[model samples]
Each structure stands twice: as C-alpha cells, then as structure tokens.
Target: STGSATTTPIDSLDDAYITPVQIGTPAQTLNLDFDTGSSDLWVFSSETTASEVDGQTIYTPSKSTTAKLLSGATWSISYGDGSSSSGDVYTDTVSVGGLTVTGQAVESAKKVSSSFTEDSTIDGLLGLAFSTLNTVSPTQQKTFFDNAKASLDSPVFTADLGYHAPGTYNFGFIDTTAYTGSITYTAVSTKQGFWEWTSTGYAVGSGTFKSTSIDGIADTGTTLLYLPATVVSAYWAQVSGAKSSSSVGGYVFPCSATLPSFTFGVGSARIVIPGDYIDFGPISTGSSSCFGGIQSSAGIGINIFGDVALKAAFVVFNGATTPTLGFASK
Candidate 1:
C-alpha cells in the first residue's frame, strides 16, 4: 500500500497545512502540521495547563485504552519564531492515511508558548525530519514516517504543498499524476537533520544569474523564503519602492508596486518564484504597505526554502539508499 494521505490548508492561515491523523485505540482524530524542519510528534493534550490550551483540541491519553506512558520521558522544543512546547510522553497507536504504527511515541504537551496558544487550529506537529532530531530525552523518539517506512512500498514521500489551496502529503509512494514535468533529483545531505541542499546560483527577476552558491533547507514549516541578506537586498532592489523596515520586520514595499519574480538554481534547472508569491501580504490593518515573503536569513546562517518557495513545485523527499530530493513543476 502507498499509505497516501491528503493535507488540508486552513483558509485563514494559508501559511501552514494540516493532515488528519488518528491516535490511540478508539482513534482520537487531530489535524497536525507535517513539519519537515524539525523532528518530534507532539500535541496539545489533557496534560497541558488550562490557560495554555486556548482553543486547541487536546488529546486525552487516559481515555485511550492502548495508551502507555514512557516512564521518566520528557521533551521540549523551540522553534526559530520563538514558539515552543514541552511535555511528557505516551506510546499509542498512531495512523496516517491508512498506515498504522503501533506503539508510536506521542509527546503530550503540558506547556506551550504564547505563539502556539494563539494559533488555535493546529492540534500538534507531526515531524517528518530525521529521527536524530527528535527531542525525547534519555531515549530519542521516531517520527510517524520513520516508524512506518519499513512497511511502505517505497521509502519516500512527496510534498505537494499548494498556495492558498489544499495539498497532498503522499507516503511510501509517488503519484506520477501529481506533477507535470520530469523529476530533477539532487543529492541531499542530512548532516544537519534537515532536507538541506545547496543551490547552484540565484537571479533577481529576469536579470543575470549570478554564480553564487547558497546552502539552505527545504523547510515546510517555515512560512517565508529566507536567503542571505545580500541576496535578499538584491531582490528587493529590483522593486521600485521597496525598503527594509525594522519596525515592520523585514523588507516592505508599496502594495501596488510591480514586483519581479525570483529564481533559484537546483542543478541545471531554475525554479522561478512568481512575483505574487514574493509579496506575502499587507504590513498591517489599514496599511497600504506589504511585506516581502523573501527575506534575509542573516542571523540563522542557513537559508530556508520555506513554503513560499516549495509551493512553486512538486517536491519529493526520497529516503532510498542515499537520501535525495527530487523536484518537478506542478
């Protein structure tokens, strides 16, 4: 079986995507963010403080007959955006699509950051990164994808993340019908526990493609495309009224500005990000300003090919022999 699953996007926050997952014996359902940036399957649960729960759906392990606590186990994780969650651990039946993994480690969050509490739609995060990145202490945990790989027809998953639309996260097999062009494969180095790749070059608009290399990760959890400050500066320079705004946080331009497309090199293929995708949205309420989705990865060091960039193509995360990433036009 391919063990394929469909992912749905929340209309309000087109920034993230969620997939329905069944946990525990009787199957408590939750919509989880399948994140490639980090590794840890954690959820807002009964253990969480009432004040921290907000509007999130909580998973009650006690209600699940098959749930078992991993004695003395605990986990804590912090994101780049300062969002964080910490919790105890539980072992239970976790299923995605129709693929089931018995004794899957489900981290039950007892504490969550204010950023997470405010975002009510996401029940938890289903990490798809390497198992080494898992936060469970004393003994690490395996992600849902890691636990189900052995039973999969192929050690692979395809991310068809769409722009303001529903997408599919196919497991164990690739659907040939989803993409339009031939898949271009690139060697992926998992040294950093991320789907990291080095882009051969980049270009601003239809300008000259500079032979400059930028190392970055294909992070589905991140909302914007983050590159080096110099590259970001170069891109914004093409925009007529663009300026870096310390108050607005990142580069902002006039809402009616004519924006140019940004392109990144992957081997010989040039993946072009349409100008519309570059303009994330308006700065704030009643403001005629807009923030550029492509920003500077100055402090982070490594660039991030986040959803804004990934949504431009059909991405394949291949776990065969030497882990590699394949991309094709959608």
Candidate 2:
C-alpha cells in the first residue's frame, strides 16, 4: 500500500517544509521536517529544558502504553549549519500519512541547540536518508521509511516540492499527474550517506554551458543551493552590484538586481532555476540588500541542492537497489 501527505511551508522564510506525523499508542500528532540530508527521527520531549521549549509540541512517551525505552541507548546529531539535538531512545508506534510502523525507534530530545529551540514550529525531524546514517547508539536505528519499505509495492518516494505552494510527498508510489514530460534518471553515489550525484555541466542564463563536474547532495532540510566558490563567483559576476559581504554572509546584491536563470545538467537532461528564485528575498526586512541563495560550498565538503534547487523539479528518491534520483520539470 502507498501513503502520501502535504508538505507546507512553516512561515515567510520559505526555508523548509513540514508535515504531520502521529506517534505513540494514543497517537500524539507532531509536525516534523522531512529531511533527506540526515537520518534520525528525533522530537523535542519533556526532557528538553522548559525555557528552551518555545511553542513546540513535545513528545511524551509516558503517555503511550506502547512506548518502550531502549535501555542505555542515546542519540546525537549535528547539521551543516551547526544545528544539533541529543536525546534518549524509545521503541514506539510511528505513522506517516496512513502508513504505520510499529516498534520504530524514536529519539526523544533532552537537549537541543539554539537553532532548533528557536524554531517553535518544527517539533521534530523525520530523516529520509539511508538507514545507515541513523544516529541511535548500541545499534543504529532504522528510519520509518526503511522499516516500512519492505511492505511497500515499490521502494520509492516522490518529492513534489514547490515555491510558496503546497507539495506532496508520495511514498511507495509516483503520481504522474504532479509533473510534466519524461522523468530523467541519474545515478546516486551513497558512499557519503546522501543522494549525491554529479552535475555534467552548468550555465548562467543563455551563456555557454561549460562542462564541469560538481558533486552534491539532494538536501530538503537546507534552504539554499550551494556550489563551489569559483562557480558561485562566476554567476554573481554577471549580476551588477553583487558582492560577498561579511555582514550578510555569502553573496548579497541590491534588492533591484536582476539575476539570470541558472541551469545544471543531470546526465543529458537540463533543469533550470528561474532568476527570481536566486534572489532569496531581502537580507533583512526593509533593507535594500538581498541575499543570493546560491552560495559557496567551500567548507561544507559536498555541494547541496537544497529547496531552492529541488523545488524546480519533481524528484524521485528510489531505494529499490542502487539508489537513483529521477528528475522531471514541474
């Protein structure tokens, strides 16, 4: 059987998408960020400092008869942006859409960083990466998708992400109605615990499509696209008034700056990101400065095709065998 759910934007930031999931025997519902970059289903809990808890709903294992603590087991995770969370482990019922997975390992957070504690809307994170990336100790935990994949007709999921619009994550099935044209497939190198792939080439607007190899991961949790420093510089060079600002971080340009469309190759297919999407919005409200979402990935090791990039196409995360990424124009 298949399952699906709508992913809604949290706020005006348009940085991430969240979906509701039910956990425990009584089914306490919580909104979670479905992240493809990390692997751990962790939620804020009673253990979290009361002061740190803003308006987030906490998971209470004590309220669930099916909750069973994994004695001595604990988990900790860190993100590229320096966000982190740590917690104890519990085996409980976790359901996404209509699909249920019993005995799913749920990490209950006792400690969280300022990055997470400050975001009140995100109650937890639902990791969609490979199960091997799971952080639970004693034994690595399996994600809800990994546990539910065996019973699915097809071990695949489609991400129909959109810009300031509602999108659906389809589990074990692909809704052809959501995208147009043929889906182009590319090989994913999971050696780095990500849906890492190589871009054959890239071009700024109608310029020459220079053939260059760029390796990166498909990260839903990330807000912007990150490429090599050289490539980022090249793109911004064409935009007047665009420069690297220490005050703003990354590349920033005048609010009126008009940017050219950017395109990256996935095998023989080319996916283009609209010019407006590159202008990430004002650096801060009422300011004349705007930040470019595509920035330098110098320190991050791997480039990231985040929401700014993924939203341009319909993506398929195929886990049936050698994990592949299928992209189609939306």
Candidate 3:
C-alpha cells in the first residue's frame, strides 16, 4: 500500500521541509525534518536535555509499550554548521503518512546543540539518504525509506518540495497531477551515502548554457543551492549589487537588486529557478541587505542541490536495483 503526507517549509527561504510521523503503540506524533543529505532516523526523546527542549515535542520510550533498547547501541552526528545530537538507540513501531514499519530504529537524543533547540519547528530529523550512512554503533540500522522499500507497492518515493508552501511526499507511487512534462531520469550514486547526481550544465538567466558535468547531491535538508566558486561568481556578477561576503557568511546583496533566473540541465531537460526565489529574504530582521539563495560550494566542499534548486521541479527517488533520480518541471 502507498502512503503520503504534506511537508511544510519552516522558514521563508524554504530552509527545511518538516512532516509529522507517528511512533510507538499509542502513536506519539512529532514533526521531523525529512532530510535527504544524511541517513539516521533519530528523534528528540525523553533522554534529551531539559535545556535543549523548547517548543519541540519529544518522544518517550517509557510511554511506548512497543519500544525496546538495543543495549549498547548509540549514535552521534554533527552538522557542518556546528549543530549536533547524540543518543542511544531504540526499536519501535513507526508510521509515516499511512506507511508503517515495525522495529524501526529510533535514535533518542540525550544531548542537542543550541541551534537545534532554538529552531523549535523541528523536533527531530528523518534522514532519507542511503542506509549505508546510518551511524548506530555495533549495529548499523536502515532508514525509514530503506526499511519500508521491501513492502512498498512500488519501490520508489517522490519529493515534491515547495517554496514558502506545503508539498506532499509520496511513497510507493507517483502522482501524475503533481508535475507537468515527462520526467528526466539520471543515475544517482549511493557511493558517498547521499542522493548524489550530476548536472549536464547551467545557465544564468538568458545566458549561454555551460556544457560541463557538475556533481552534486539532491539535499532537501539544505537551504540554498551551492555550486562551484566560478559558477556562483557568474550568477552573482549578473546582479549589480551582489557580492560574496566572508563576514555575513557567503553571498549577499541589496534587496532591490536586479536578479535573473537560474537554470540547470538534466540530459536535455531544463529547469529554471525564478529570480524571486533567489532573493532569500533580508539577511536580518528589518534589514535591506539580503542573502542570495545561490552560494559558492568552496567552503562546503561539495555542491548541494538543495531546496533552492529542488523546488524548481518534481523529484523522484527511485530505489530500484540500480538507484536513479527523476526530475520533471511542475
């Protein structure tokens, strides 16, 4: 049977998409970030520090009759941004949309970073990357998607991410009404434990399309589109007031800057991101300076095809024998 649920962006820049999932016997519902860049189905639970708890709902294994500990199984993960979480592992029944899985590894956070607590919208993270990336020690666990794939009516899941709106994620089947035009399928390598793929080229507004392969990951958890320094520089150069700043982080410009749409190719298919989407709102509250949604991957070390790029089209994560990614304009 297939299952689906709506995902809502937490911020104006579409930083992250969150969806509710049910866990354990009576079903403790929590909104979690559906991240494709990492692979660990963890949760903010009873063990999480009281200081780390804010408006987030926590999972209590003690409250779930179906919960069981794996003894010494523990895990820890840190983001490039300095935020991290560490905890023990528990197996419990979990359900997303209408799809259910028994004995799903639910990593319970005993500690969390300040950034995680401050962003109250996300109580936990549900990683959608390869199961090979799971961090559970002694016993590596499978992700929710990987565990559910065997029972899925169709060995696939689709990501219809949105910009300042809610989008539905579907399991086992694709909804024809969600997108327009035919999908362009590309090979995705699970080699590095991410939904990594290659883009044929890119174009800045009405500029020439560069003919080169740019390797990147389809990371829904990431907020912006990160490309090579040269590519990002080219896109920013088009805007009169745009400049890459080390102080505020990456690229920033005036709110009234004349920006152009960005385009990328998958085989012969082209997806365009409007200029409005690239204007990632003001850098700070009531400020005129704005941050660009497109930034350089020089510091990040890997190109990230995040929400800024993914929202331009419909994406399908086909988990067949040989994994592949499908893209189609909506």
Best by lDDT: 3
RMSD of candidate 1 to the truth, in angstroms, is: 1.2
Error of 3 at 156 (Å): 0.9
Model 3 alpha-carbon drift over 4 Å, by segment: none
**TM-score to true structure, per model:** 0.97, 0.97, 0.98
Q: How many backbone clashes does candidate 3 have?
A: 0
Model 2: residues with Cα > 4 Å off, grouped in runs: none
Write candidate 3's Cα lDDT for 1-330 as tens digits: 788989998876687889999999999999999998989988888899998899899999999999999899999998756789999999999999999999999999999999999999998999999999899998899999999998999999999988789998999999999999999999999899999999999999999999889999998888889999999999999998889888899999999887899999898899999888898888889988899999999977899999899988999999999999999999
Question: Residues 194-251, candidate 2, lDDT per residue (tens digit)?
Answer: 8898888899988999898898999998999999998899899989999999788899
Predicted structure 3: lDDT: 0.92
By TM-score, the better pick of 1 and 3 is 3
Candidate 2 TM-score to native: 0.97
Report model 1's TM-score to 2 decimal places: 0.97
Candidate-wise lDDT, in order: 0.89, 0.90, 0.92
**Candidate 3 RMSD to the correct structure:** 0.9
